[PDB]
Structures are given as C-alpha cells and as structure tokens.
Amino acid sequence: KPVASIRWLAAPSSSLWLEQAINRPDEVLIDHAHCERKAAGAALQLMFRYPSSETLAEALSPLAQEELEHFDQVLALLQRRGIALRPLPAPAYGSRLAGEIRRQEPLRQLDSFLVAGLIEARSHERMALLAEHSPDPELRALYGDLLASEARHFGLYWLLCEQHWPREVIIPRLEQLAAVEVEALSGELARPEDVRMHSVGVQL
Ligand SMILES: [Fe+3]
C-alpha cells in the first residue's frame, strides 16, 4: 500500500483466500493468465466504445500491450511447469460487477472505468499477497515482477475518470461499486479447486 495512493477496495482479502490460493497454486495461476488477457480485452473494448478519444487511446493501448506481455509471462510459467492453459471456469465476480454498469451513456463510461479499476485493484492486492507470502520462489518472483512494472498511485482508471467527471460524482459512485465488489467476494469456497484470483474471501 504506497502512500499518496487512492483506496479502491472497501475490504482486504481474508486470510483464508491466501491459504486457499497457496493450497491450489495451479488453478490460481491458470486463472491469472486468463485474467491478464481479460484485462487487455477490457482496455480494448473500452477503446472500441469511445473510438475517437485520443486521451483514452494513449492510455489504454499501452495498457493492453502490457497486459498481454503479462499474459505471455504467466503462460511461460505455466509452460515451464508443464501446466496446461485449461478453460478453468471464471468465478461470478466479473459478471456480477459488470451487471452494475448502467446501460446509457455517459454514465456507462464512468461505471465501466470504475469496474475496470476495481478489478485491477483487487488483482493487485491479491498478487501482492502472493508476492510476499507464497512458499514458492518462482511464484513470488513472477508476482513481484508483474507488480514492479507499475508505480500506480491513483490508478490509470481513476485518472481517466477525472478527465471527464468531477470527484463529487466519481467518489459516491466508486463507494457504491466498491460495496458490490466486496459483496461479490462474500461467501465461502465450496471446493478447493474453485480458488481463483477473484474467488471469495474478504474481511468484513
Ligand atoms: Fe497485468
């Protein structure tokens, strides 16, 4: 948690998430790879939604390129370990958040940037736990290297919000969406193999 950063998340991950992720590292890693790729797809999709925004393109093209470089790095690790890039099912988290995004412009854009930001903040928080806590050195080095290529204070998605919206508006909407994000992570994991980067486990 760097100072002069914005707090995105309304609650930290639970001890038990971390324990579960260490217990089934393969599932978490496969899922992580899909998440990186999904994160690039979101950046691109937002450009396709706002195709004449040069400020958005200047920010989200490099981000997409970086998310694919992270995907390639996770896939290299899976491949170095002999783990198949399996079609492992995604948790309900992303679909649940995206269902909060309003249908009309321009509030749809605000909501989309905030959801994208929430997802990345949660990935970040959990990747940082794994980087510090995992007993597997190669995972600590992957997760450390992926978080290194950063220096995020506000979050790219926050700055995009500020381009088009006052804080007076951003702030109360992020509070609402941050509340749904923690409700999406509430619950208990039904089987160990269901652990994911965005499976349940927060402290309330
Ligand atoms: Fe990434």
Automatic annotation (TrEMBL):
It comes from Synechococcus sp. (strain RCC307). It comes from the Bacteria. Fe(3+) binds at E36, E67, H70. Keywords: Metal-binding. This is tRNA-(MS[2]IO[6]A)-hydroxylase. The gene is miaE.
